[PDB]
Design a protein around this nucleic acid. Structure first.
Lengths: 151, 121, 217, 217, 121
RNA sequence: ACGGAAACGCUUUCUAGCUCGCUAUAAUUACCCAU
């Protein structure tokens, strides 16, 4: 197997800063299990085979499938999901159970069952013990909110 | 009793122990406790959780003792609230509220009760 | 010896108590949905200098530009030599230094009818066609809080005779803030800032403000 | 050319308005639905948000064809003065609704006044079986006169309309007299009068001589 | 005497010391004191608790002295109220009511009496 | 006679725009009690 390290930089950063900060970012991917991508930082070091079948195509499609087939949610809903995914107290499990159930009540009832298939699938991977699918969806929301940012 | 680890799954198991409307099976599993009744108890605690972050404990404990008035008065009438405070150990949790960390724990314990009420509703 | 540095002391005694928004974090489940910015070691309301700079600039931007500046860099040369400009290599290190305003009368609001220095305002919206409700709890500072305000001006040797032109601009920037709001939901109240006890003193030597404190009447 | 126009009307009640809040630690057998007070003086106030929420939602049935579902769907005569967040050029539009606090502090006194807020007992009577369910809500008392302080804001975009944008202000000061200024509104609660309006120019040297005389009809 | 810590459990122990209707065991444990009788005493105190939050103490103490009239007059007749004010130390609590904080404590002490009366009823 | 010397992570930037604590609600019911 192989192991990749990707680093997201702005324009006109020096390449000696580019190639080192991704050179010592695949070193974090040579220490996970050596079969791992590491994205943009020293964390997000997913196993590579797990990165495609459980982030890049499993979750990121279903996050793309929701917000491109609805109307009333948006980046504000995405941003408060990321903030509840970064911290993750035991209190934030219950606090997110209120936040997703409160938004069923607010939709227009022609999208409520569509949102209900989102929040029963979102809250499924948030509350676990393996701590695996949580940071996957913490990453899968980053790449979705990256690709939708207007100037 | 509730510590910083277990003040949520105690509150989750408390809401599940609330006996439902087993009568009148049209729209079943509704609770005898209602939403706007529970928010009256939360608005008590979710204004001390704000003032505890700003003020000290000793300049604030007069309103803390009045929670033991309110949680009994709101449960002394309209018995579905008494079903809450006996199952969710509210009056026992007010016995141990000696510090700001526990004041911010019980006021956060009530928010877990409102959360799982809305979730299992 | 044409380098001095003076300070406009003031007292921001406000009305329609203000909401300079702070941590837009995911709040608690029934608590304040939008708190204010606060000092950490005392948990008192502050008025930050950045909320005083951008607010007083855009009010002064509508007076002294002669064309609609689409950027803060496109402000005229009388704004950019006070508030600073980044695209000019000559108007960096802008002349004005604004410091964060803290509660002066924390003891005077004590022993009076108020207890906590922030009051929470309950503010539902009404849906237009279905008449629903969505309750807001916007924290804002109480009415007669007084804030110590200081306004370091730096007399560079390139200032020449512009020192008296700037004080026509800063006083007018302090006169627009007494008409417009200061931070937060200003078209619903929340502004009404009164600058009182306006006076200039020289915190660094060799300048005479004897013929200037009459402009701050 | 930039100018600010102030409207110092006086909001005098006839039926006592109830712009509520929620004192969270209220009492048993006391006011369980209070009005919002001034946090220091404990006088009842009228916020600008309850004014702006009743100016817009009563002018959205008169000056709005293709009736709006959201406030973002107001048909750009109403959005020009009340702000519109879903628009490139209508955000923060030209009106500031300052809070109307209280004026007659000692003219209500020497009529015979214990407290500035009365308490009304109200009793939801169950029709079947005649069950009683009392409630105690506060009201600002009858002859309370409030300080309406609407502020207009003139840019160089305003040209011909300036004066078109006051008939909507004059009718908003008229469509609300036919309604209630917030409250447990259906029963009394804010059948209010907007007495002795006066427009003045507080910045920029703009004339309001022809502007005042269309506010007296 | 009652401080900001103990003005509730004194009021809880006071209601438990009210002697019940030991006679007439059909529907037992009823108190000689009744609900609408107790609310007459609360409506006295739960209109000073409102006015103390708005007014000062010195412009308000005329109604405070009339509580000592009312709590004696309501207990001088219909002896079940005298059973309250001797057990719940009402007339002793009016001796120490010198400040707004204690005025808001006794008027809140009466609300704890109405709460546990409704709860143990 | 130090891979050294001199070098401010710094300039510009409003947590801001939109948002009614609103919705329904007769302080009322019952007719005795004490000797």
């Amino acid at each position: 197997t192989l192991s990749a390290g990707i680093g997201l930089f702005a324009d006109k950063t020096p390449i000696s800063l580019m190639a080192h900060q991704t050179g010592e970012l695949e070193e974090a991917a040579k220490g996970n299990e050596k079969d791992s991508i590491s994205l943009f930082s020293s964390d997000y070091t997913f196993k590579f085979d797990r990165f495609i079948t459980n982030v890049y195509d499993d979750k990121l499609e279903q996050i793309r499938y929701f917000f491109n087939h609805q109307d009333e949610r948006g980046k504000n809903f995405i941003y408060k999901l990321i903030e509840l995914l970064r911290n993750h107290d035991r209190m934030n499990m219950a606090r997110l159970a209120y936040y997703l159930t409160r938004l069923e009540e607010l939709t227009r009832e022609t999208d409520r069952d569509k949102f209900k298939t989102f929040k029963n699938l979102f809250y499924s991977w948030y509350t676990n013990k393996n701590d695996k699918d949580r940071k996957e969806a913490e990453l899968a929301l980053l790449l979705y909110i990256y690709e939708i940012r207007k100037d | 009793i509730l510590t910083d680890e277990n003040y949520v799954d105690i509150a989750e198991k408390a809401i599940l122990k609330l006996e439902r409307n087993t009568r009148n099976r049209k729209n079943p599993d509704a609770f005898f406790l209602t939403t706007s009744k529970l928010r009256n108890l939360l608005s008590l605690t979710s204004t001390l959780f704000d003032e505890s972050k700003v003020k000290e404990y000793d300049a604030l404990l007069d309103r803390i003792a009045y929670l033991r008035v309110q949680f009994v008065y709101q449960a002394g009438r309209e018995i579905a609230v008494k079903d809450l405070i006996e199952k969710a150990q509210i009056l026992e949790a007010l016995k141990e509220i000696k510090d700001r960390e526990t004041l911010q724990r019980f006021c956060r314990y009530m928010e877990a009760l409102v959360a799982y009420f809305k979730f299992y509703g | 010896m044409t380098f001095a540095k003076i300070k406009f002391s003031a007292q921001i005694r406000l009305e329609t108590g203000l909401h300079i928004g702070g941590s837009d974090a995911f709040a608690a489940i029934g608590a304040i949905n939008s708190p204010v910015i606060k000092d950490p070691i005392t948990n008192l309301p502050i008025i930050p200098g950045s909320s005083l700079k951008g607010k007083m600039r855009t009010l002064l931007a509508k007076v002294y530009n002669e064309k609609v500046a689409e950027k803060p860099s496109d402000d005229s040369d009388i704004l950019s030599r006070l508030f600073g400009n980044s695209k000019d290599k000559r108007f960096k290190m802008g002349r004005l230094i604004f410091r964060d305003a803290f509660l002066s009368n924390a003891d005077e609001l004590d022993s009076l009818g108020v207890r906590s220095y922030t009051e929470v305002k309950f503010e539902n919206t009404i849906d237009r066609i279905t008449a629903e409700a969505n309750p807001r709890q916007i924290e804002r500072a109480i009415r007669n809080s007084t804030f110590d305000f200081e306004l370091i001006y730096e007399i560079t040797d390139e200032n020449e005779n512009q020192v008296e032109e700037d004080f026509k601009v800063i006083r007018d920037g302090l006169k627009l803030l007494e008409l417009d709001y200061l931070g937060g939901s200003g078209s619903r109240g929340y502004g009404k800032v009164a600058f009182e006890n306006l006076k200039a003193t020289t915190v660094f030597g060799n300048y005479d403000v004897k013929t200037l404190n009459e402009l701050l009447t």
